[model samples]
Target: MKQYLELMQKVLDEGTQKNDRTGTGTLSIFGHQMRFNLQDGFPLVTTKRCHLRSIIHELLWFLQGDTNIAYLHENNVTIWDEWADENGDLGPVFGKQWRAWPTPDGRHIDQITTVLNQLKNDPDSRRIIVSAWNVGELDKMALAPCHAFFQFYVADGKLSCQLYQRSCDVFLGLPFNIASYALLVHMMAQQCDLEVGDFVWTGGDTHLYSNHMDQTHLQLSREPRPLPKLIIKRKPESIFDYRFEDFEIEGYDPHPGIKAPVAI
Candidate 1:
């Protein structure tokens, strides 16, 4: 948690002001990185309370290869609603690309399935990767991928994941991104029967939106609490078989939630 606070401080001290697509402007920086050792604790941000309900549902939806917000709406997760069409479709977004990347021969490749198999059968392989940045298909998406590519590595019976995000909203979106990927790493480790290692995050264009300055200051004022532990109730048959009810977070005593406007 200190690492997160340090990163925020770094952005505030070193970030440059710039205009962005939303026209709200931001204090932007080019690149930054953070690493969390999963063996220590779950890396959920503690300075402000964060709800994992939406994030869990969102990850599950992505694993299902869903391109529409109907599944999210059914679970009361509205984060994707802003980007969906009237019919709830979001074109070929993360889930579509992860679970069903179309090939030139008109077939689809399930990147998640492929990665899982690799983690089990070829743990030593350096080629264990899952990418959502399908360059040729960018225009077909509701929003271009932000957390674009990720690769998993195995060593000493532990599985580690590294995520590369091309664009990041530091104040509002970064925590969610961290938790989402950490959760994914935990699940993947469980499925592959490996001990959890590090969750390494690399961001390209990281920025804090102009409107979130007050919220950011509020967060920075508070001291971070102890990292929480994630508990999976039972081992699912597979990664896809996990339900929201199967996961529980223990000993998470966080501060109150701070509300801020999201940049669309």
Candidate 2:
């Protein structure tokens, strides 16, 4: 997790001040990358505690191809509450693009399923990608995609993933982003019966909002602990069949939680 802190420090030291869509100014940098070797440990941030409840459910919901927040609300995950409409729909966002991307010829593409098939049947192929940034569909979304595109690579019987995030809120959203993708990588590796490799995170327009300065400094002052281990109790028939109870984390003793406002 020291890499996480170092990334925050890099923004503070070199980022420029810029105004953004939320009207909250930020110390922003254009591009950055960090890599986590899954063989070491799970890439959960440990300087401050992070709740995975929302993360796990969010991934599952995306896999289900659901664009509404009803399922999230049923599970007590409020992270998406800010962007959902009165009808609780987020219109053609991640879920839609990932699971059921509509094509011009009245066909729907299941990006997740495609990726899984590639991982199993053609592990050496470089075309294993899932993109949530559908050009024609962006305007319909409540908020444009941030963690927009990701690709998986297999080599030496190890599965690795890289996520390219177009927008990142370093203090708040980045931790969740890291954990979410790492978890996905782990699950995907398990399904492919391959060893976990690196979880590479690349960011564009990375920033720390003005309001989260105190919490950011507090987190920076603390030391990063050893990363926790992710344990999946059972292997479901497929990636989409996993439940919240099937996953557990071991050796995660992080610092106290830090509260920060969402920049919705």
Candidate 3:
């Protein structure tokens, strides 16, 4: 995980200071990528205590095609609280875009299923993409997605994933982003009967919100604990069949959790 830390250190030390749409300022940079091999260890951030409970549940919720905050709220996961509307809707977010992407007809297209089908039927196709950035639907969303899009690649019978995040509050959001996409890759790979290949993270306006500079320096001062191992317990042969409880973790030892305010 030192690779992650060093990349962050470089961003903070050399990034240019800039303002943002959230009215919060940032030290911004562009074009960053990180590769993690799932064979070694899970890429859970060890420097700071990251709760896997919510991350796991949230991913499951998205996979289930839920755009409402009700499920997340019920699970005590308040991360999406600020973005939910009066009806608890986060219009056409990851869940909607992934499981039931709207089409010109009155029908919905399941991008996850489509991607899997393409991987099985057309392995050489370069159009195996699952896009969450629905331009026309962005305005309906309570908050625009920071983790905008992702793509899949299959090579040597192994599956890999790359996420393209348009904007990121690097300190607080990047770690979760990495874990989420990497885990998604693992789950998808398993369902496709392929080995976990690589997790490639591609970013656009990745930056440290100015408020987190001190926190970043503080995190840098501490030593990273060994990366934790994430164990998923379900034998659901299909990706659509696994639920939240199917995931189990055994070797996660970390420091106390820290509270950081989300920049609304």
Candidate 4:
């Protein structure tokens, strides 16, 4: 978790005040990236407790080709509630794009499935991309995605994922982002029968919400614990088939969850 600490230290020592979507102003940095080796430890934030249950379930929901908040709500995760419509629809979000991205020919392309096939058949190919940026469907979404897309690279039987977040509420979002992608890497590596490798996070417009600066500083002053271990129950043959109880975080000891609102 030293890498995560460095990110906070950088922002506290050098970040500047910036206006943002959340009314709470931020002391933010523009662009930054961090990488975590999954073999080292799970990258859940020890500075402030992060709910792995919510993250894991949310991801499973996404892979299930669901774009509604009802499933998320039913599972006790409200992270996506703010962006969902009254009926809980978030049009063409990750699940829809990954599992059922519609094409001009009326065919659906499953990016995750395709990626698995590529890794098994052509591990060296550079075109293994899973994208959520559907321009034509952008206007139909409640909000355009902030975490826009991801790419995976495989070499020497290890898998690494790079996420491109177009807009990030750093103080509140980055930690979750880190955990989400790290888990994604783990899942992908397992399905592909590759070793869990590095998880790289790349950000664009990765700003902090103004309201969280004080809490950010409070968190920065705390010492980080040993990175926790994530235990995904038994291996499932496919990424999409994972269930909520299938994942667990063992060795996690952290401070209480800090309440920070999201930028709409």
TM-score of each: 0.98, 0.98, 0.93, 0.93
Model 3, C-alpha of 179: deviation from truth (Å): 1.0
Model 4 per-residue lDDT tens digits across residues 97-186: 888888888988888889989988998989889999988778887777778888889887899888888877767778888898898888
Question: Which sections of candidate 2 miss by over 4 Å?
Answer: none
Q: Once model 2 is optimally superposed onto the true structure by TM-score, how far is the C-alpha of residue 214 displaced, in angstroms?
A: 1.5
List, in order, the clash count of every candidate structure. 0, 0, 0, 4
Candidate 3 lDDT for residue 142: 76
Clashing pairs in 2: none
Error of 1 at 166 (Å): 0.7
Writing each residue's lDDT as its tens digit, candidate 3 over 99-183 gives 8878777688899899988888887788889888878778887767778888888899888888888887677888888888878
RMSD of each: 1.0, 1.0, 1.7, 1.8
Order the numbered candidates by lDDT, best leading.
Answer: 2, 1, 4, 3
